[PDB]
């Protein structure tokens, strides 16, 4: 969705920055720019000014303490952000074709534990959805424009699970129903949903969250909605295995067979929890 | 055209994954939003042409020996990974990882990718590794092994300072396109 361009958040910390110190912009970089790129540009431009051992990038995203900062060094916080729309603002970017025209809300996500780490288990993992609002709205005559308001949102560990699932249920959806299909792209998505060898994979999710119907009904809205996102998941892996069967040649027969022996192993295991 | 299939193999716990996901999602190693699924996709621009690159992420344990090469057919390119501060992961590249992908795909090109090169130049790990009778892997010694085994080239990167990270994935696509 870099039909709109690439957007990073840039904050400046340190006396050596004069008029910038403690300002926060949103930069509009041209589409497909990698965090590596601009961070190299920014620090390498201020390595040309102040001295190389003076520039330090805040390889982070959640907010900035200052007493932890060497008051001699120049610190930059660089963070990728995405445009953020109302559920109404989005609907209208679907029908009408002109879409790049009021970009003034941008969002990043930062994870955390209550333990003060960055990551945890599935039952430990929180997420902060931060929304930045800008002084003007892109496109606009300058390429940076500085932040003015700001909103934290907190996702409970189950909401985080739900968000992962939905993203992936649709990753299938899209690769399946696309023409001309990309076999390599679809197998990659599918083999990583049902045939995961590295990360913990979807079954451990429903085990954590879907093994006890919670008493608090504020939490039922979440528990049950996770159950339904699994029902829709399971139906999109079937629908994908079914598609990849239409697509592979001889060499991937055992490959495909294993992806099927996987998904059936898994849907058996799922069905006690999803009912 | 269409996706390029890059299958990534290497000893577990060398940050194979930590650098896959942190590049492809514009996160630092510190802020990547975790997940349960595997494999990552990323458009990479190269000369005003946009190429999409599927990243298949394989477990490194012997347990998955029987099942890993199922992902090998139709692979376009391979990333073989050791961490330069991990002299077992480096020897597991001569004696396991490279003999395998070239058994199954004797014509699919491959790259040597050294990783975590920030602890090489770190004065607390070198005198940590040396107090075990080992040094880190200089690029000198890695470069030969790649020529020794006719990899396209060797590339090293830091997940954490993003150094040479983009060069890794840029070479991959170039390798595949030839």
């Amino acid at each position: 969705e870099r039909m709109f361009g690439t957007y990073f958040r840039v904050g400046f910390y340190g006396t050596k920055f004069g008029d910038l110190d403690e300002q926060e912009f949103v930069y509009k970089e041209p589409a497909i720019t990698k965090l590596a790129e601009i961070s190299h540009r920014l620090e390498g431009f201020y390595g040309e000014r102040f001295g190389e051992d003076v520039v330090e990038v805040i390889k982070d995203s959640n907010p900035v303490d200052k007493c932890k900062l060497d008051p001699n060094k120049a610190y930059i916080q660089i963070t990728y952000v995405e445009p953020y729309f109302d559920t109404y603002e989005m609907k209208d970017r679907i029908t009408y074709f002109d879409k790049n025209y009021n970009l003034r809300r941008f969002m990043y996500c930062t994870p955390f534990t209550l333990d003060g780490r960055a990551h945890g288990e599935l039952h430990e993992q929180f997420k902060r959805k931060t929304i930045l609002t800008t002084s003007h709205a892109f496109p606009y005559i300058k390429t940076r424009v500085n932040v003015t308001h700001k909103e934290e949102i907190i996702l409970t560990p189950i909401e985080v699970a739900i968000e992962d699932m939905q993203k992936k249920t649709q990753e299938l959806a899209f690769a399946t129903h696309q023409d001309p299909a990309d076999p390599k792209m679809l197998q990659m998505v599918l083999q990583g949903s049902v045939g995961t060898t590295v990360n913990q994979g979807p079954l451990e999710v429903a085990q954590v969250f879907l093994s006890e119907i919670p008493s608090d009904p504020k939490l039922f809205r979440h528990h049950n909605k996770l159950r339904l996102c699994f029902k829709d998941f399971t139906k999109r892996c079937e629908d994908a295995l079914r598609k990849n069967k239409s697509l592979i040649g001889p060499d991937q027969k055992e490959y495909q067979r294993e992806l099927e022996r996987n998904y059936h192993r898994l849907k058996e295991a799922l069905q006690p929890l999803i009912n | 055209m269409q996706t390029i299939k890059c299958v990534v193999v290497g000893d577990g716990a060398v940050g194979k994954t930590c650098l896959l996901i942190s590049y492809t999602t514009n996160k630092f190693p510190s802020e990547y939003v975790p997940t349960v699924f595997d494999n990552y996709a990323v458009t990479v621009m190269i000369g005003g042409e946009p190429y999409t690159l599927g990243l298949f992420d394989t477990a490194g344990q012997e347990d998955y020996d029987r099942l890993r090469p199922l992902s090998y057919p139709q692979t376009d390119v391979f990333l073989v990974c050791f961490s330069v501060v991990s002299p077992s992961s480096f020897e597991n590249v001569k004696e396991k990882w490279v003999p395998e992908i070239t058994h199954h795909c004797p014509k699919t090109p491959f790259l040597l990718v050294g990783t975590q090169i920030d602890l090489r130049d770190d004065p607390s790990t070198i005198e940590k590794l040396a107090k075990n009778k080992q040094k880190p892997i200089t690029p000198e010694t890695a470069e030969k092994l790649a020529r020794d085994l006719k990899a396209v080239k060797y590339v090293e990167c830091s997940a954490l300072t993003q150094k040479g990270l983009k060069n890794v994935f840029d070479e991959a696509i170039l390798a595949a396109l030839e």
Side-chain angles (χ1 to χ4, degrees):
Chain A
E1 90 153 3
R2 321 207 189 118
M3 84 204 291
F4 302 116
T6 307
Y7 292 95
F8 305 94
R9 175 266 305 269
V10 187
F12 296 110
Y13 304 85
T15 296
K16 279 197 148 77
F17 277 133
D19 299 45
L20 281 168
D21 195 16
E22 285 207 3
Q23 287 187 333
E24 252 197 351
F25 308 76
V26 168
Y27 274 52
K28 171 175 182 158
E29 288 290 292
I32 316 308
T33 326
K34 306 291 102 168
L35 185 91
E37 214 147 343
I38 176 176
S39 178
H40 179 84
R41 254 169 59 235
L42 269 179
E43 161 178 25
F45 174 62
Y46 290 86
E48 290 179 348
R49 234 172 168 111
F50 303 170
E52 294 67 12
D53 50 336
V54 201
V55 199
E56 311 258 8
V57 184
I58 289 186
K59 308 181 187 67
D60 192 13
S61 53
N62 81 339
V64 179
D65 175 13
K66 300 207 105 204
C67 35
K68 283 195 176 187
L69 281 189
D70 196 336
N72 175 34
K73 279 170 181 171
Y75 292 99
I76 306 181
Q77 186 177 37
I78 318 186
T79 290
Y80 179 87
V81 314
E82 304 221 302
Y84 186 95
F85 301 137
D86 302 328
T87 37
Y88 292 77
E89 247 156 35
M90 280 207 116
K91 276 201 166 162
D92 277 30
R93 315 273 145 86
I94 286 185
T95 88
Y96 199 66
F97 74 102
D98 168 42
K99 315 193 206 300
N100 185 28
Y101 74 85
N102 191 47
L103 300 214
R104 48 170 292 142
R105 284 233 279 188
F106 306 72
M107 178 253 276
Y108 61 96
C109 273
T110 86
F112 65 100
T113 65
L114 293 197
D115 206 7
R117 295 155 290 157
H119 308 98
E121 298 304 350
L122 280 203
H123 85 280
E124 296 181 336
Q125 195 59 69
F126 290 81
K127 189 155 89 156
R128 158 165 46 256
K129 275 208 315 163
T130 321
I131 294 176
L132 306 184
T133 315
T134 41
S135 148
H136 297 308
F138 296 100
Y140 152 90
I141 184 51
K142 296 163 189 174
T143 47
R144 72 195 188 184
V145 85
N146 46 340
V147 183
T148 63
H149 284 91
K150 177 179 269 203
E151 331 175 86
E152 281 108 38
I153 296 178
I154 321 164
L155 269 61
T156 43
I158 177 178
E159 299 175 295
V160 174
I162 300 196
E163 295 252 271
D164 196 6
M165 293 284 297
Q166 307 197 298
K167 174 159 51 198
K168 176 66 69 144
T169 306
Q170 228 270 333
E171 203 164 356
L172 295 162
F174 174 90
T176 295
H177 296 110
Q178 78 154 121
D179 252 358
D182 201 333
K184 282 158 188 162
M185 181 47 66
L186 163 47
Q187 310 173 17
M188 193 213 74
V189 176
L190 172 73
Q191 186 251 295
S193 297
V194 296
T196 87
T197 77
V198 167
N199 292 275
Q200 34 196 301
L203 214 170
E204 194 148 69
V205 179
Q207 286 170 342
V208 175
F209 299 83
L210 297 174
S211 287
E212 270 162 355
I213 293 205
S215 301
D216 204 293
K218 275 184 174 296
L219 290 43
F220 199 83
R221 298 241 185 122
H222 292 309
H223 166 287
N224 194 86
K225 190 193 162 176
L226 178 53
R227 180 184 64 94
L228 295 194
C229 294
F230 262 93
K231 260 187 180 168
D232 255 31
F233 184 74
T234 203
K235 298 169 179 178
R236 291 302 149 278
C237 320
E238 158 158 13
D239 273 13
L241 289 165
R242 183 187 179 277
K243 177 64 180 287
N244 209 41
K245 230 175 169 50
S246 312
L247 303 180
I248 63 171
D251 74 332
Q252 279 165 125
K253 263 188 58 193
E254 204 184 339
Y255 179 45
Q256 158 87 7
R257 187 191 296 107
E258 154 80 346
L259 307 196
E260 305 180 12
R261 224 202 40 70
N262 285 339
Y263 162 80
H264 307 143
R265 227 193 42 176
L266 160 63
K267 185 196 184 59
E268 297 302 321
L270 281 186
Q271 205 176 331
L273 313 156
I274 327 296
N275 291 11
Chain B
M1 43 189 310
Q2 277 192 325
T3 286
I4 295 184
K5 186 177 176 166
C6 179
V7 176
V8 187
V9 309
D11 282 9
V14 297
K16 273 212 321 293
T17 314
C18 195
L19 83 82
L20 283 189
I21 167 170
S22 303
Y23 176 73
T24 63
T25 59
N26 286 342
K27 295 297 204 183
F28 281 109
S30 325
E31 44 167 334
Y32 78 84
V33 199
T35 183
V36 313
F37 298 92
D38 282 313
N39 307 336
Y40 315 94
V42 52
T43 313
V44 172
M45 290 227 57
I46 288 155
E49 312 267 277
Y51 299 82
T52 307
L53 177 76
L55 300 182
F56 293 72
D57 183 16
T58 85
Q61 305 64 35
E62 300 136 319
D63 317 297
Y64 294 84
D65 278 334
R66 304 251 274 192
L67 286 167
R68 172 174 48 258
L70 276 182
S71 284
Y72 292 170
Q74 298 293 314
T75 297
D76 297 304
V77 76
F78 283 99
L79 272 52
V80 202
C81 288
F82 69 91
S83 170
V84 297
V85 305
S86 190
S88 100
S89 81
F90 185 59
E91 289 282 303
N92 276 315
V93 170
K94 291 182 196 183
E95 65 176 88
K96 177 174 172 63
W97 288 125
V98 185
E100 164 164 316
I101 61 186
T102 61
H103 174 275
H104 290 84
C105 284
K107 297 162 174 179
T108 303
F110 77 98
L111 277 49
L112 261 79
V113 185
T115 54
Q116 289 172 349
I117 70 167
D118 43 278
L119 323 189
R120 191 197 280 114
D121 293 287
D122 167 45
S124 93
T125 284
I126 281 192
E127 217 64 46
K128 213 165 161 184
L129 308 184
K131 294 184 207 288
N132 323 130
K133 301 292 185 203
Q134 325 203 303
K135 50 195 67 177
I137 313 308
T138 72
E140 273 81 34
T141 78
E143 276 185 33
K144 204 243 185 163
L145 192 273
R147 192 165 48 84
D148 291 343
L149 321 189
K150 320 294 177 191
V152 199
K153 54 186 59 175
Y154 161 80
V155 292
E156 53 166 60
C157 67
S158 170
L160 169 63
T161 75
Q162 297 281 320
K163 189 206 226 272
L165 193 63
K166 175 166 161 286
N167 179 251
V168 168
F169 300 106
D170 281 351
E171 296 290 342
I173 308 176
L174 298 175
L177 292 187
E178 211 75 349

